[PDB]
C-alpha cells in the first residue's frame with residue numbers, strides 16, 4: 001500500500017499537533033467519551049501495516065481512510081471525530097485513568113454511582129486498559145480516600161465483585177464461574193441472586209481478587225465487570241462498576257452494546273427511567289443510569305492499522321453517538 005502510506009506521510013508532515021498532556025485540567029463530566037489509540041505491535045510492523053490514525057489535539061482523532069475512485073485513483077478520506085479526550089500511543093494507563101475513571105472515584109464517596117466501560121474491537125486494548133489497569137488504580141484511590149479524615153469518620157467498608165456476562169448468562173469469577181441469576185421486582189429493582197460481595201482492606205487484596213478472577217475468564221466474546229461497593233454500616237453508600245466489554249467486531253453482543261448506548265444516552269438526558277431491560281449488562285447496572293449524582297465514562301479503544309480501518313470507523317461511529 002505504498003501510495004496510501006505516502007499520502008498519509010504528506011498529511012502528517014503538514015499537520016502541526018498539540019495532543020493532550022497531564023497539565024491539561026481534569027474535566028468534570030456527567031458523560032465522558034474518550035478514544036485511545038494503541039501502538040502498532042511488532043507483528044503488525046512485520047506484516048507492513050500502515051498506521052492510519054492521527055491525533056492532532058486533545059479532542060480530535062483523524063482516520064486516514066484509503067479510498068478508490070471509479071477510475072482507480074487512490075485518495076484519502078480523512079475522517080475527523082471529536083471526543084472529550086483523545087489518547088495517543090504515548091499515553092500510559094495512568095494518564096488515561098486521570099482523565100476518565102479517577103474523577104469518578106469521589107462520586108462514590110458523595111453517595112453516587114459511577115461506571116467506566118472499555119469498548120472496541122478485539123485486540124484494541126480494552127483489557128490492557130482495565131486489567132497497572134484501571135481496576136487497580138481505582139481500588140488504590142478508594143483506599144486513599146477512605147483513610148482521609150472526612151470519610152474516615154463515616155465507618156466505610158469496601159467490598160468487591162467480579163463477574164462475566166456471556167450469552168445473557170452471568171458467571172461469578174470469584175466463586176468458581178457459578179451461573180448466578182438476575183431478577184427484577186415490581187419496583188424495577190434488580191438483584192443478582194447468589195453474587196457474593198468480598199470484603200477487602202487493601203488495594204493489594206483487590207489485585208489478588210482481579211488476578212484470581214482474570215485467570216477464570218474466548219474472553220473476547222464476553223463482558224467482565226468489576227465493582228467497588230462502599231457500605232457505611234452494611235448500608236450501601238456508593239458503587240463504581242468497571243467493565244471490559246465484549247469485542248464489537250455476535251447478535252447477543254451487538255444488542256448488548258446497543259442497549260448500553262441507549263442507557264448511557266438516557267443518563268445523559270437525566271431521565272428518570274432508562275431502557276435497562278434490553279440486555280443483562282444494562283439490567284445489572286440499571287441503578288447506575290439514573291439519579292442526580294450518576295456519572296459514566298467510556299473509553300473507545302482502537303487498533304491503528306490500515307487493515308482494521310473499517311472496524312475502527314465502526315467503533316468511532318458508535319462512540320460518537322454515546323454523548324450528545
Ligand SMILES: Nc1ncnc2c1ncn2[C@@H]1O[C@H](COP(=O)(O)OP(=O)(O)O)[C@@H](O)[C@H]1O
Pocket residue numbers: 037038039041089120121122123124125126127128129220247301
Ligand atoms: N496502549 C497500549 N500500549 C502497549 N500495548 C498495548 C496497548 N493496548 C493494548 N496493548 C497490547 O495489545 C494486545 C491486545 O490488547 P488487549 O488489551 O488484550 O485487547 P482487547 O482486550 O481489546 O482484545 C495485548 O498484548 C496488549 O497488552
Ligand SMILES: [Mg+2]
Pocket residue numbers: 126127128219220244
Ligand atoms: Mg480483552
